[PDB]
From a paper:
Insulysin (EC 3.4.24.56; also referred to as insulin-degrading enzyme or IDE) is a zinc metallopeptidase in the M16 family that has been extensively studied because of its role in cellular insulin degradation and amyloid beta peptide catabolism. It is unique among the enzymes comprising the zinc metallopeptidase M16 family in that it exhibits allosteric kinetic behavior with substrate peptides increasing its activity. Crystal structures of human IDE (hIDE) complexed with peptides show that the enzyme consists of four structurally related domains that adopt a clamshell-like structure enclosing a large central chamber.
One segment of difference density was found adjacent to the active site of the enzyme in domain 1, and the second segment was found in the structurally equivalent region of domain 2. The first ligand was modeled as an eight-residue peptide bound at the active site, where it is positioned to interact with the enzyme through a series of hydrogen bonds with the peptide backbone. The second ligand, located at the vestigial active site present in domain 2, the distal site, was modeled as a seven-residue peptide that is also positioned to make a number of hydrogen bond interactions with the enzyme. Both peptides adopt an extended conformation, aligning along the last strand of the central sheet of their respective interacting domains consistent with the usual location of substrate peptides in zinc metallopeptidases. For the peptide in the distal site, the main chain carbonyl groups of Gly339 and Leu359 as well as the side chain of Glu341 are in position to interact with the N-terminal amino group. Additionally, the side chains of Tyr609 and H332 and the main chain carbonyl of Gly361 may make hydrogen bonds with the peptide backbone. Posttranslational modification of this type for polyhistidine fusion sequences of proteins expressed in insect cells has been noted previously. These data indicate that the ligands observed in the crystal structure are the cleaved polyhistidine fusion sequence bound to rIDE-E111F. The conformational change induced by peptide binding seen in this study suggests that allosteric activation occurs by destabilizing the N- and C-terminal domain interface.
Numbering used by the authors:
A (entry chain A), B (entry chain A): 42 to 965, 978 to 1011
Write the structure that this text describes.
Amino acid sequence: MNNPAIQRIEDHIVKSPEDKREYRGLELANGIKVLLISDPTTDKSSAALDVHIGSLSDPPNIPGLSHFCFHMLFLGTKKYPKENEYSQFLSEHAGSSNAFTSGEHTNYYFDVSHEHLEGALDRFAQFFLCPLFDASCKDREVNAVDSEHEKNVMNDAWRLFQLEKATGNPKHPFSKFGTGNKYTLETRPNQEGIDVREELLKFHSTYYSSNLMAICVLGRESLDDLTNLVVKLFSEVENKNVPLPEFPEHPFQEEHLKQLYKIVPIKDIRNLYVTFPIPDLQQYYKSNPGHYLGHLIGHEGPGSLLSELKSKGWVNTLVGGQKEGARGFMFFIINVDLTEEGLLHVEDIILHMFQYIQKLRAEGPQEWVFQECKDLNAVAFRFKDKERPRGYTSKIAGKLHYYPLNGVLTAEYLLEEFRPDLIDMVLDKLRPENVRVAIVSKSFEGKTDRTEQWYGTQYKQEAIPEDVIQKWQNADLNGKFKLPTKNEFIPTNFEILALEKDATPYPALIKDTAMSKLWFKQDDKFFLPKACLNFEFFSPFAYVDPLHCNMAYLYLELLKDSLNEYAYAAELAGLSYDLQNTIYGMYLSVKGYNDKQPILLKKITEKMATFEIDKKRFEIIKEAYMRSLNNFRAEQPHQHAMYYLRLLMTEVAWTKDELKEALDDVTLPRLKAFIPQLLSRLHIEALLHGNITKQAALGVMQMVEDTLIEHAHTKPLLPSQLVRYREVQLPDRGWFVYQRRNEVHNNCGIEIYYQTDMQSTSENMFLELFCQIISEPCFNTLRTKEQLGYIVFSGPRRANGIQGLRFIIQSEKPPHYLESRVEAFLITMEKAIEDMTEEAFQKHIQALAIRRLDKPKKLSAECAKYWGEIISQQYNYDRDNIEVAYLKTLSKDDIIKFYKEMLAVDAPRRHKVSVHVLAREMDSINLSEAPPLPQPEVIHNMTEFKRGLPLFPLVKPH
Amino acid sequence: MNNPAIQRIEDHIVKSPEDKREYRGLELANGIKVLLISDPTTDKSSAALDVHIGSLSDPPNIPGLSHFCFHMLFLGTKKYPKENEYSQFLSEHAGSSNAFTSGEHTNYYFDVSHEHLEGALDRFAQFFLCPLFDASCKDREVNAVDSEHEKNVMNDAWRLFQLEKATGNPKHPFSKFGTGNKYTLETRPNQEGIDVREELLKFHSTYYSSNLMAICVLGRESLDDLTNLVVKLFSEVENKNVPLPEFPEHPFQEEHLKQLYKIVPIKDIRNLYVTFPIPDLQQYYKSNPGHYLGHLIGHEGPGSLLSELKSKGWVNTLVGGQKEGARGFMFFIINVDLTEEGLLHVEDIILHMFQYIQKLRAEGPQEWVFQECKDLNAVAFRFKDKERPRGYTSKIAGKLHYYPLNGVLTAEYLLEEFRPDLIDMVLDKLRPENVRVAIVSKSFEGKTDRTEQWYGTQYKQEAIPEDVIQKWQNADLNGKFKLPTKNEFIPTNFEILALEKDATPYPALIKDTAMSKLWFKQDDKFFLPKACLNFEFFSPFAYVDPLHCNMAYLYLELLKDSLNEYAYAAELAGLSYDLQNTIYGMYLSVKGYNDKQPILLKKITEKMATFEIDKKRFEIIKEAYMRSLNNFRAEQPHQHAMYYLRLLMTEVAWTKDELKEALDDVTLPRLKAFIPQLLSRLHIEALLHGNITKQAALGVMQMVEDTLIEHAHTKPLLPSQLVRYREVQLPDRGWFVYQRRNEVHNNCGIEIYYQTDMQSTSENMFLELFCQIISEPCFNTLRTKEQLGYIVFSGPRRANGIQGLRFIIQSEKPPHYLESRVEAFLITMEKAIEDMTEEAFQKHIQALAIRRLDKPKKLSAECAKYWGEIISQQYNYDRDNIEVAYLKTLSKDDIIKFYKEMLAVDAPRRHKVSVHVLAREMDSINLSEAPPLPQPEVIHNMTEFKRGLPLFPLVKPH
């Protein structure tokens, strides 16, 4: 009795009781799996379509056709032939989109203003009904794919990824190159024949079948309405009845086992990768054997494996468990980072891994553990934070291929059966004869034979001698490896306290004293048994010079290091904390189930105020920290540009250079002395937010104070004597440039900042609307036409109460060229604005309003927003409504004037600075015309530079 | 054979061999004693006339007629009848003048541009040949005299002065009121008859006689030329053959002896004054018995009297020796400040004084001591720094009454005969039966019977019981009081090192390293065996908050406190040091004979780096420091205005309030810990200047470094990471006012700052020429016509690289009135400038040039100038020539424009701030017309105030 397009309906979708959203499952006649989500309060709607095809179905001759294809798909359709029609519609209706290819999945998704779902879906749908696939872009698009590849070329992580693929069976599709590039996309085709337009079309026509598609749609409309909408748009997708691809033989045969790889990294890291091929455990999701083992093998603290490897001073971090492969196969991995001593004991490290394993075989599957995991995940599922719509549908579309409708939400969180047998089964694969091991370290440089062909990775491939393998099999049992004990942090009070009648819509200041300032809000919307605790400890000794910055950093690193064992239980129990230094002191945050928060907070604070430094932990943390500062050189060029702009524009900021130099003056005695000093006098500013009462907030706040006062003898640092840092003020019509060499990448980085004025409602909305207007053109113009790089960003920059427009580009071209192109873009944008219809303008106003008003979905999102107002000392909690009201009154002329005053080449108040991060070797047409530009004043000393310019005031508190 | 006007010539004037100046003594026929000084290199000339009449010859009915008289004398003459002709001539020719009355002397002096000596002297001379004495000023002048009196009314020092006079014989002129006021000057005359115009004339005509006058004149002209000039101008002064006044009976008879006075102070101090009347020792200057005793009784360190009084924790400072009275009598005094414990032991304190005395009688005069004093003073005289001309002639004119021509220079420095007899003679007066004692302390408040009539001082007068007197006579001998030992610091190497051929005209940077920056110049002009050593130690821990400011202060106070005994010898030996904290760290300066500098510097630095705090010294220094912060409330209203402006305009500055509050958190352990921290990391910037070689400078600099590094383990604070403070930047057209209560004075204070722009050659000379032009009008208008107060100041203000115009007034009127009057003055000045002749303008340019170019006369003057360039990090050593060159190119129009841009009510870039320090009770006509003014923005929080305004850059180094 269902509509002819629908085979089967619903299933009753099993969801969390807390979840007010309404759900319905569907199976279209044409084989499409579908989940509809009705949320009547949602500000943005969203949809995702996932194709169960990826780079694994890439033809042998054209690797990356899959990736290439989704690039081409966005590029206009028969009904909507404009090349950027999709994205421009999304931009102009508060929307955004993205897409991705993995081995077996291609996932396309977007969100949009809830009032225009139908129109966003009609367009998205066309991509699966009639793509133009025209060759005017086929040639450009390749550039974007190429630089995409290029950017990741020097990225270690990606290099290792594609290196585990070539270290495997070449006649297995796993070995194929997923990303693609210009070398195998435009080029190999002409010089070997073959039309990459015809090839695309074939692929798209063999593999783009409805039987292999899943869709998820979220909107305000009712389920019935969404049903019709979906049926109408998607029911006529073409079914090709493609058998689902499968890879059951497994990419790593006995020949690839017992292998060892010495890889040379770009960054100066030391990592060890251990890998056991395993059969596909997908079908077993109701019991999850691979992650019961992952849970014990990647466990931390008391008696765990990592604990031991840490005590030998061999390893700092351990991650272990099951890893995706493709339908038919998986892997079980165990990764660790090596200390200096660790790198000399790889063999002995691994022996310990098999020793813990062996201990598992000895001990055998344990029901109480699985039972514990079961109960945590259940609560975790019930009390899951409400997700952002765009990320939810995308995740759901993917999961639709693996589970029945009624179980698409609960799958992967809820366990059921306990299965000792399945667990033993996987356990049996973890043996020396199944092991692939990979060491990454710069100590191999110059002495590698092989070049992985796509990324260029140096590396050695060798076989692990029999005796070694034999030693590992001779893995007996190390007494130390104990199992985890019952989890004390598992919460049992999920009572949601009633809303105090004195409650308020924004955080209220409930305590203003010389020692502490406490902001507090009781949750009035999410009603989950969760609380966010935020503390900012102020002390001048944290950032007073580079030596104390270093000491502040090491202190917390050392503190966290020794709390870890104890803290892991909490984390598994959905209770986490963060602790880091800042230019003002230290930041302590605790999030999660509120029930046992007070016990964790007590332990952290106690340890803070009574800490005692293990000599040995000290040198390791320091050597790591040391190596980490050096490692900054390896970062992306754009990441460097941003780092230097931040230093440049701040009255006081210590560069990594300065920190490195000062690090060698840090000894154990010095550090021991510095702690009491740091803790000697303090001011604390706090936000406590969530499922807590006023009484409970003050109580939590007292215990922090009292624990410090009694144990470290802390006394009050009056707020009035806390020195805050100002932003540097650029001179009218000035242009400064700071130029630096990057010594790894053959790409250059660039950040251009046009500083405007002190933050305020009007200045804020001028900058933000102007940015909205240019957000998609910047993308469509500088990236999708001019192909200047994979990274092309524009938008607002905020810091120290000041703001301005920034552009960020990573590119093969020289900075001065990017620079000229950006100015060229600025002119076009100005004309574009002069020549834009009023109603297009209003859509831009309306689009920015929607983004701004879009309410946080979860506590930590609402919390972070408020914490932003505290950090910045503006305390403007009602900001969003105010600014949007003001936004709605702007007119084209206002934005034009704004532009002419602040941003034009000829602006009387242009304030421009550029950071140019030069490539390794570098350096020092129909296109629109760039204006002539001034000669930059060149910065050779950030300090001299700042000393010679005035400083901004600080922003007045709201 | 001498000119008929000259009785006797010269004497051959005994002078220092080092002294290139030429001298000649004279005795005019009319009894005038005269010294001429020819200095052909002098930039400014000078003269002084001293009359041997003072407030002691004041008629009984009109006290202060003497003071009054010299006010009236400046007020125009028959030949030069313009009321301010004298001072306006001096202003317009790089000159300045002043005058003063004491008991037996009235001293008038001026300096002037060397090119216009004759014209300045002609006018000065008229005052002693034919004063108009007109009654149009007689009525105004009284105001200035009155506020003069009023200002000192709340000044403790003056109150005690006039209180020792009324505690004496009323029929002795000593008891008369010296200052005068409106109460006894305009008033008592009408209501008791008597013309204060006729009275003046009488006085002036009985006492203003040539026989009682001495003159001293310094100019470029030759001695012969000065002779004629003087004879011509002064030979016809009228001789009245007044017998020289004398007061031989003595103001304090046996009735006033054995007295005790409990005085209530304005400031919260504790002081004890012990006073022995003695006969006049003037005649005995060749042997100076009073100051051989002063030398031993006011000695400090090893075995001295003060040492003991300090160990009992009774007293911090001791000053002892002979004190001026008047021809016929003197006093020998011994003053100390009391700790809290001291005030409870006055009796026991004094007993110790007589015990030391008794020890002197026991021991008897010692030839070696007098011999030591003799030799020090001789070297001191030979190597005396060349004096500023204005202060030299004034001093010499005074000394001309007491010594023969040929000995006027050497008198009071050179000893001759040793006279055990004279010493014993004075020693015999120091006995309990001769003693007057005075205690000053707020602990007496409310319980005094008597009001000294002129100042209003509360106080009790009582007689010292017999037994007390008896106890003091029963002053035996305290073992501890040892004599001073031979003086090891007495220098013996006065060799002037040859001028290295690599020498330079300005300090050169000879050492730029992470630990130290060393500026060095070898003396190329004074050639005295003297050196100035200046060290600025930078550490952020000195001023990081109020607690560390306090600790930095106490540290140095404690350090100096324990070095004193050791240092006194040096000081007597012409070798001194200064040591104080700053917002950047600490300042150590050492000046004097270079020979033993290195031994003193070594001891100071050593002690700095190894200091150990006596518990007991600690509480005393702290209680004193504490009391001292409270005592700021007692300061002059104008002094408060200046203090608050400095806080207001500096990015970071800790108020005395903040320091007081933070002081109670300072304990001994805390302080002990803070020292190593402070010394932990340091940067040093030095100026070494004088009679030292490059090799000797570096050597001196190394020993400071090496002594710190080896003993406190100091390591380098890189200069680049030293945070310097900026000046606050006022907004265009802004007017801010900070208003505060003064709780002691019935006068209000005011400072008005019109901030201009960052310092630079042009901005500097605009402000400085404008100031020159208005310097005398401001005086003549706001003070001498409008009589707004005794304190009326205007001129340049420099701080943190910024500058502006300031006016400072202390007044009976309310701030808003002064404020209006000042603006009224500004308008007049503008018109005055528009309407001033070109050649009058040029004289102003020429007058400022002369002041600026006028070369330093001594090492520490040249040193201080250079140290100014270092402190301020501008290093503009050739400043003076540059700025004057630029000065000479300015025109009226430039100054007008300057004024219209920056200073007018209507200036588009006026930047005005006013500090108003209100009187105790207060508050919150032909006159020129004040313009309407804006409503001030009012400051209630210096901090909020600064946070809301931008900050200036720092000035670029030259």
